[PDB]
Write a protein that binds this ligand. Structure first.
Ligand code: CL
Ligand code: CL
Ligand code: ZN
Ligand code: ZN
Ligand code: ZN
Lengths: 197, 197, 396, 133, 396
């Protein structure tokens, strides 16, 4: 006379055959990589907990739906119901931190926890911008560089990956290297100044 | 993360089983909370395993054909679509044993669709189970896993992030950059680039 | 005191209840009390002083409040709570030690250390919650001039005293009549000796009276009374009252006669026990009067008749005894006792930091000297340091 | 023997490296090896023998994998790891004791206990890693 | 302690791995750990204290992170790393030295120097990583009340003692029966001597017993037992026990008879070896009982019969020896051994900086005095300073 709660795939689209299942998971890997976030701000996903007795919020609206369904269920333990009604987010604006309750499958939790714990945004300040300028231009007295902007402590940036060539295209890739030097030559042509007088 | 959770994700799918055991002995249907009576195999212990992907790739059906002709108990392993049969009459007709001969006929395994019996009070002929003394058995079992139950304690997490920040991309846009008059531009040696004036 | 005790009690509750896997609802009220404590203490600087060898220590409180996020507490939550609790326990122990080593003649009941005086400020009153221990309850009731009492198993109510009174004496100390007694802690072992065995007494009876004035009133006292005094029933060579020479004592124990234990309060006869031995109850008294008679046995067997001749020399001195043991009592003032560690704790702290002798307590917190001259100021200071010591014992 | 050594080395590394506050990158390879060990051991029953006074002991493996997605290991992570580590250490110690008290004349270098013979099966070869002692 | 060890381990790894030309993939995890250490330490001020003659030193950390954008490390990268590494190594050496020279009776296991207490704060726990050393492994295990284990080659478990007991003696010291022994380090040499050669002993057997009580339980101990004691097999002039007079010893060595080595735990015989000498195993014991008999040989050649007359004077004294050498053992407590350097390092640091004697250790860290009275507080302080010494010896 009662149903039971079980975890199910939201999208059950797995093919038949082991090789096609492994292909499915490669495609899943590509999907995760393309949709992988560079940063997260949970407050954007924070919604209201309908059964909260303390102005509680949860992330995300799917958690809200699940929590409401559990709260209404007659087979739920009274302690779980009371905890849903009492569980609280913590917003510490002074520390620039937020904590929200979420309901997640352990695998979903692992993915979201990895995204939260490995964001690509670093603090951005004037020293980092100044060092971003090439050093030989910071030392040329023909150029006057000034920092007339105040960056808040909330400023972030993503560092470019300027690793030197791991493929060594200058070695034994004649056609590719010809193309690389041609494109670089075109760009350098665009930036060379025109002669005057 | 994907590689470690692949098996769990694949076994959660409702449209593929992980294999099928052909045991030409009469095995009692398991009693599972998710099905009622079900010819479900928890594992493959006690059977020779034929990998279906390898069989598809090689094209060599000698061992499988010899085993099927001689009624040699075997376990076909691989992602398989299955038919959910809720008819007690289908089990009494032993139709789950009728699905493998096409493997030999066609030397293919991509149309193998084993029968997963699901016998419970919702079956139209369930009275046969209820009103007679007999053990429902079948000679085949489907290697499939049971859904994981939702557990609130194992699903509730606190997600933490920053309250808010602004990401920037054009770092050099924060730099005010002037130049001296070109008449006064100097070279590395601190003398004017052009001195003929 | 109430704030210091509340801090200690909150910390003890946190240490006992904020445990891995416990229901969030086990700790909700405790988490609220703990957060109130943290909020009150945040942004306050404390200095625990440098009296004696106790080091000067500085305490800063900038701690985050505990969350409420898991249905069952996990190891991370307990770790954060334990960090905060450990710092707070260190601070409370240092405040308790600092208070335990100070004293004042005039306001000995009031706080003495800087930190406890600060904690008496109105701002910290919010920390205060359940004051349920015997000592804090007695403290609160005493601040309100309400009747309350401390229960003591074997109260150390008698200052140590092992002396004798001679009522009949000679330079040669061979025909002696008098009393010996040991008053120690909760025990009074008294004995009356007649060397002549009351040969020349008016009715062959020698009367002995021992009066012990308790320095504080005891109530609801359970007392064991036994006929003999085992401490004065073996031969002894005893110094004379000035110590010029030594006399000899060769007791032979006889049954005490007309034994009368009177427990007196304000000179009134509160409890009277005639010839009763074993367990007796003294309702409420400040004085014990033990009156017992040595009666020469009217009929003697020849060995007994030979023990006691009619005239000197006397070799077998007739001794009657009495042993009184206060096994448990109630006193309106704090006292050392056999079960509690408050005196030992205060003394250990004072000895281990070389606290100079103050103007209230005797050197080394000697209990005999303290109880002998148990003045009201000493009572106030001792109640303060004992309450602080009991607060300290809840954590250390 | 190589598999038993790999189990022990994995457990020793997990004890030494899975500690509170540590960067996950310090332990990432070890966590991969540990999860591989769990996967290979899950679903197998072992019996360490009753030779002499050494008691008969039965061992079952239905352990979950350790997490991989934290920047720094926390107290919860250490407690979860320790629970599995203790069982695996007990099993490895019992297998070692069962193998240490047995001998054979015909083939004394080959494993003697049932558990070590089972662990020599190809299905456990995945556990094998750095053999440095 | 684990944070101090983690700093030292990171510095050792950086010294070994950050080398010119090496693949960055060889160091990526080490670089991440090193940068985490730099971030955690940056902005923190430390003072390594001025106990004894150890100079006060102030440490400031404002260091840049090591780069992550190379394929192979070059000379620039190595030099940038090495400056920071030098500063950090100096800091860790000074922290370790500050901790090694300190002790306390109360919490000798706990940190004593200010810098190590600071490093115990949660804001440094991120530095913590692989705790693979035996000393740090046992430190973590003992923090959790888990079974610890230290492996010792020739453990210094016996305090030095060159003594004798005379069970038969007289002022002439010419008919003596007794035992002499040197218990030093991991070696026990014992020798039972009878001057009369058990001429009058019952059955012509003289039984000698030597019980040595180890101050800690040793497990899995490999021991060499040898029949003779070369230290008591040559003529000596030995002082008397009071030191008043000197007696003479002129041993002639007979092989010991019915040799019984018992290894006992709480007085229960765990291991028993009878007439076996080569190499034995004591699996778990804290007491060694050596029983050995001088048996007057029933048949003698004329020279031997000349050595041993029926009565005094006795000029050739029949001695039966025994040697017991613990080659390797396992102890749950730290110990000095012949291979390690923890005791030597701690003693050297305390000597070089003229550290005054403290409440816990004997002067000069003398090992005989220490191990004779190996109290629990002494064990805690010793494990702390020995773990710190090993951490220091990783870098110095
Ligand atoms: Cl008692
Ligand atoms: Cl050696
Ligand atoms: Zn008692
Ligand atoms: Zn006198
Ligand atoms: Zn002598």
């Amino acid at each position: 006379l009662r149903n039971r709660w079980y975890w199910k795939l939201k999208r059950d689209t797995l093919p038949d055959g082991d090789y096609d299942v492994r292909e499915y998971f490669l495609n899943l890997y590509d999907q995760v990589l393309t949709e992988m976030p560079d940063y997260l701000l949970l407050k954007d996903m924070a919604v209201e907990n309908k059964n909260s007795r303390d102005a509680g919020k949860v992330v995300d609206s799917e958690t809200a739906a699940i929590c409401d369904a559990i709260f209404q269920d007659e087979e739920t333990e009274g302690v779980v119901r009371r905890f849903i009604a009492e569980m609280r987010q913590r917003v510490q604006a002074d520390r620039n931190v937020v904590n929200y309750p979420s309901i997640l499958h352990p695998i979903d939790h692992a993915f979201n926890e990895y995204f939260l714990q490995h964001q690509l945004v670093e603090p951005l300040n004037n020293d980092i911008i100044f060092n971003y300028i090439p050093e030989r231009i910071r030392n040329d007295v023909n150029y006057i560089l000034n920092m007339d902007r105040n960056l808040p402590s909330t400023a972030r940036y993503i560092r470019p990956n300027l690793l030197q060539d791991r493929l060594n295209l200058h070695d034994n890739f004649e056609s590719l290297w010809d193309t690389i030097t041609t494109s670089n030559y075109i760009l350098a042509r665009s930036v060379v100044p025109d002669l005057k007088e | 993360l994907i590689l470690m959770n692949m098996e769990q994700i694949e076994r959660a799918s409702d449209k593929i089983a992980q294999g099928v055991i052909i045991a030409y002995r009469d095995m009692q249907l398991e009693r599972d909370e998710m099905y009622g009576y079900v010819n479900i195999a928890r594992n493959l212990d006690g059977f020779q395993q034929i990998n279906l992907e390898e069989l598809m790739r090689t094209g060599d059906y000698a061992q499988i054909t010899n085993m099927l002709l001689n009624n040699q108990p075997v376990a076909l392993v691989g992602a398989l679509p299955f038919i959910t049969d809720s008819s007690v009459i289908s089990l009494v007709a032993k139709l789950d044993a009728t699905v493998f001969a096409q493997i030999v006929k066609l030397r293919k395994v991509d149309t193998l669709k084993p029968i997963l019996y699901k016998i419970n009070s919702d079956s139209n002929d369930f009275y046969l189970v209820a009103n007679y003394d007999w053990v429902p058995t079948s000679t085949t079992k489907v290697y499939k896993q049971i859904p994981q139950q939702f557990d609130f304690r194992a699903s509730m997490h606190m997600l933490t992030s920053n309250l808010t920040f602004t990401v920037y991309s054009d770092l050099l846009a924060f730099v005010s950059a002037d130049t001296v008059e070109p008449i006064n531009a100097v070279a590395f040696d601190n003398m004017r680039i052009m001195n003929e004036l | 005191m109430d704030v210091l005790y509340s801090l200690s009690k909150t910390l003890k509750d946190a240490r006992d209840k904020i445990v891995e896997g416990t229901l969030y609802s086990n700790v909700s009220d405790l988490i609220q009390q703990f957060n109130q404590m943290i909020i009150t203490m945040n942004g306050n600087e404390f200095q625990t002083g440098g009296i004696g060898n106790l080091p000067i220590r500085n305490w800063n409180f900038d701690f985050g409040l505990l969350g409420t996020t898991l249905l069952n507490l996990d190891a991370n939550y307990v770790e954060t709570a334990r960090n905060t609790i450990d710092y707070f326990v260190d601070f409370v122990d240092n405040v308790c030690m600092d208070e335990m080593v100070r004293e004042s003649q005039r306001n000995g009941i009031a706080p003495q250390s800087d930190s406890l005086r600060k904690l008496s400020g109105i701002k910290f009153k919010r920390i205060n919650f359940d004051n349920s221990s015997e000592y804090i309850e007695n403290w609160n009731l005493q601040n309100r001039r309400q009747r309350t009492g401390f229960t003591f198993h074997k109260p150390n109510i008698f200052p140590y005293s092992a002396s004798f009174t001679l009522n009949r004496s000679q330079p040669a100390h061979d025909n002696l009549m008098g009393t010996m007694w040991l008053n120690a802690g909760s025990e009074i072992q008294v004995a009356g000796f007649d060397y002549s065995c009351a040969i020349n007494a008016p009715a062959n009876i020698q009367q002995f009276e021992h009066i012990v004035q308790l320095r504080r009133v005891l109530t609801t006292a359970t007392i064991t009374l036994l006929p003999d005094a085992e401490r004065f029933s073996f031969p002894r060579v005893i110094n004379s009252a000035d110590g010029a020479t030594t006399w000899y004592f060769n007791p032979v124990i006889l049954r005490p006669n007309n034994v009368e234990v009177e427990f007196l309060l304000n000179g009134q006869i509160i409890n009277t026990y005639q010839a009763r031995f074993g367990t007796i109850i003294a309702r409420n008294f400040d004085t014990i009067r033990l009156s017992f008679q040595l009666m020469r046995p009217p009929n003697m067997t020849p060995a007994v008749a030979a023990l006691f001749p009619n005239a000197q020399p006397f070799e077998h001195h007739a001794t009657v005894g009495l042993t009184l043991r206060i096994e448990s009592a109630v006193c309106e003032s704090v006292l050392a006792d056999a079960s509690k560690t408050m005196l030992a704790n205060v003394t250990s702290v004072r000895q281990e930091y070389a606290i100079p002798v103050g103007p209230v307590f005797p050197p080394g917190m000697n209990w005999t000297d303290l109880i002998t001259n148990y003045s009201p100021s000493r009572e106030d200071n001792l109640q303060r340091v004992f309450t602080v010591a009991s607060i300290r014992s809840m954590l250390v």
